[PDB]
DNA sequence: AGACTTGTACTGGAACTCACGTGAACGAATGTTT
């Protein structure tokens, strides 16, 4: 972002489904529960920037969480 | 590829039980003292 700024646009990088206990899975569902929203390839939401690969739902990047990868 | 879940088998420790040992205590007989 400009300098002072929080960052406003975001470019998808991977999918990740492994590596993480079906409680952990339960767990992270109920956090992110609410803030799901379903994605509509018409009107694609401005945060986020994707390119062939499109989710099913989004979620805004304010209400989500940072995952590390290996 | 990778990661988790499920099924099978194995091994060590907990718990329970019996055998054996040790410690302390005691009534009766005997020996010693007065």
């Not at 952990?24 to 390119?51: N, Q, T, V």
Request: some cysteine; proline content about 13%; overall charge positive.
């Amino acid at each position: 972002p400009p300098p002072g700024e929080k960052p406003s646009v975001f470019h998808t990088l991977s999918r990740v489904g492994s590596g993480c206990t079906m409680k952990e899975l339960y767990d992270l569902g109920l956090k992110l529960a609410k803030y799901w929203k379903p994605f509509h390839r018409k009107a694609p939401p401005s945060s986020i920037l994707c390119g062939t690969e499109k989710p099913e739902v989004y979620i805004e990047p304010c209400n989500s969480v940072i995952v590390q990868i290996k």
